[PDB]
C-alpha cells in the first residue's frame, strides 16, 4: 500500500520549469526563424502555449530522469543542480518535429483566453502535477 510520495521543493521545481520553458522557447525561436513567415501572430502565440502545456503533460516522466540524476549526485541537491538538469532537458529535447507536425497537419491550436493566461504567467508559476 505505502508508496513513496512524489513531490519537489518549490525552489527546485521553479529552477526546472524556468530552464525547461526557456529551452523549449529557444527551440521554438529557431524553428520560427525557418518556418515563421507563413504563420499568423496568434498561431505563434499558440505555439508558445504549446511549449508550456507540453512541459505540463510530460512533467512526471521527466521527473523520473531528474530524480535519477539527483540521486546520482550522491549528496543532498541544491538549486543549481536542478538549474543544470532543467537546462539539459530544455536543450536536449528537440521540439522541431512537433512544430513540424502541428504546422503540416494544420493542427496548431486555436488561441483561446486560457492559453493567453498561461503564456502571461512567469515560467516559475506554471502549475505542474507530480502524482
Cβ pair 56, 126 in contact under 8 A: yes
Residue 70's closest CA among 58, 79, 61, 60? 79
What is the per-residue burial (b if ≥16 Cβ within 10 Å, else e) of 64-102?
Answer: eebeeebeeeeeebeeebbbebbbbbbeebebeebbeeb
State how far the Cα of 113 lies from the Cα of 116, in Å rounded to an integer: 5
> Hey, how many other C-beta atoms are within 10 angstroms of the C-beta on 22?
16
d(CA 34, CA 36) in angstroms, rounded, equals 6
Method: X-ray
Domains and CATH numbers, the chain: 1-131 (1.20.150.10)
3-state secondary structure of 76: coil
The C-alpha cell that represents 94 in the structure block: 528537440
> Are 59 and 130 spatial neighbours (Cβ–Cβ below 8 Å)?
yes
Q: Provide the 3-class DSSP secondary structure of residue 75.
A: coil
| DSSP 3-state of 84 | helix
Task: Take residue 23 and report the three cell numbers written for it.
Answer: 529551452
- Which resolution in angstroms does this entry have? 2.1
Rounded to whole angstroms, the Cα distance separating 40 from 20 reads 25
Amino acid at each position: 500500500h505505502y508508496v513513496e510520495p512524489k513531490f519537489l521543493n518549490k525552489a527546485f521545481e521553479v529552477a526546472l520549469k524556468v530552464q525547461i520553458i526557456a529551452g523549449f522557447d529557444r527551440g521554438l525561436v529557431k524553428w520560427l526563424r525557418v518556418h515563421g513567415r507563413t504563420l499568423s501572430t496568434v498561431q505563434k502565440k499558440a505555439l508558445y502555449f504549446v511549449n508550456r502545456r507540453y512541459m505540463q503533460t510530460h512533467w512526471a516522466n521527466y521527473m523520473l530522469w531528474i530524480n535519477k540524476k539527483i540521486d546520482a549526485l550522491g549528496r543532498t541537491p541544491v538549486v543549481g543542480d536542478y538549474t543544470r538538469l532543467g537546462a539539459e532537458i530544455g536543450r536536449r529535447i528537440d521540439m522541431a518535429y512537433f512544430y513540424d507536425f502541428l504546422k503540416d497537419k494544420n493542427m496548431i491550436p486555436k488561441y483561446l483566453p486560457y492559453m493567453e493566461e498561461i503564456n502571461r504567467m512567469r515560467p516559475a508559476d506554471v502549475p505542474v502535477k507530480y502524482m
